[PDB]
């Protein structure tokens, strides 16, 4: 869907920004600093689920740029493993949200955050 | 969810970028220059539905900036009318996609695009 590699960079940066806001805005809730409304969190995690699937298709062949470390395309199976582990951790977060359980939400949120950090460490300049 | 107004600007720009890619990438399909796969388009419109709901909450009080024309907050009912008409046109596009009908898709796509342009004309610097 991208006329030039810069368009893919633009897209993935935007997706990651949006995905990130939807994750991070829950931090006060998991810490107890903001109230827990199960329906609110269910709805937000549904948004995050959708967003979480979007960046990866914008690291397609020929789309080097931005802050993507070069190690993304040359180790494609390993990068995939990574987004799929993150993507699996998101499934867990959805299950916790859909079940209305703040303890399960806290644990799932932490494992998502660890997966963000793992990919960041390997693949972000 | 925004610590400073700049964060809301950042978010809405990203949402609009993403929403826009999901709309615009269908242009070759509606024109017949790319093949029509009903399932592909259904899935893409589902993404666009989710995205289409996101920008508006990031024009909250105190979030002047970016290319938002000042006329957004002082005429709040009219701006709302506008996003809700766009939002209603998106419902129509979802119905066309879910029904697998390229003629209905073409018509609905055009009315969405007109609604994008209408808000752009009134409210984007
Ligand atoms: C690899 C499988 C990743 C996972 C999982 C997550 N992120 Fe990431 N992120 C990744 C890359 C390779 C990049 C650079 C993209 C580019 O081309 O520049 C990023 C970037 C971000 C950004 C900055 C976006 C921008 O506006 O430029 C943010 C805010 C970000 N990532 C956040 C983030 C969060 C919160 C994640 C888990 C919920 C997450 N990322 C996962 C690679 C990967
Ligand atoms: C008002 C109800 C709008 C509708 C409907 C659409 N857009 Fe728009 N758009 C609007 C504003 C006020 C702005 C400026 C935001 C800011 O603070 O700068 C925009 C901006 C865009 C952009 C640029 C985003 C960026 O990266 O800076 C794009 C690509 C865009 N809008 C596209 C777009 C499309 C394709 C729409 C229909 C599918 C659409 N917008 C609707 C206001 C409104």
Curated annotation (Swiss-Prot), chains A, B:
Example of a GO MF term: heme binding
SUPFAM superfamilies membership: Cytochromes
InterPro entries documented for this protein: Cyt_c/b562, Cyt_c_II, Cyt_c_prime, Cyt_c_prime_subgr
Protein location: Periplasm
GO CC terms of this entry: periplasmic space
Superkingdom in the source lineage: Bacteria
PROSITE patterns on file: CYTCII
Keyword Ribonucleoprotein tagged: no
Binding site for heme c: 12-13, 67, 116, 119-120
Keyword Nucleotidyltransferase: no
Modifications made to the protein after synthesis: Binds 1 heme c group covalently per subunit.
GO biological process: electron transport chain
Record's keyword terms, sorted: Electron transport, Heme, Iron, Metal-binding, Periplasm, Pyrrolidone carboxylic acid, Transport
Assembly notes: Homodimer.
Function, as annotated: Cytochrome c' is the most widely occurring bacterial c-type cytochrome. Cytochromes c' are high-spin proteins and the heme has no sixth ligand. Their exact function is not known.
Protein name (record): Cytochrome c'
């Amino acid at each position: 869907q991208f006329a030039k590699p810069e368009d893919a960079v633009k897209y993935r940066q935007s997706a990651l920004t949006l995905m990130a806001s939807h994750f991070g805005r829950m931090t006060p809730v998991v810490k107890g600093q903001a109230p827990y409304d199960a329906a609110q969190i269910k709805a937000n995690v549904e948004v995050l689920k959708t967003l979480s699937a979007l960046p990866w298709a914008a690291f397609g062949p020929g789309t080097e740029g931005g802050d993507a470390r070069p190690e993304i395309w040359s180790d494609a199976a390993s990068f995939k493993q990574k987004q799929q582990a993150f993507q699996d951790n998101i499934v867990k977060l959805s299950a916790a949200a859909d079940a209305g359980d703040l303890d399960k939400l806290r644990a799932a949120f932490g494992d998502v955050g660890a997966s963000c950090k793992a990919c960041h460490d390997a693949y972000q300049k």
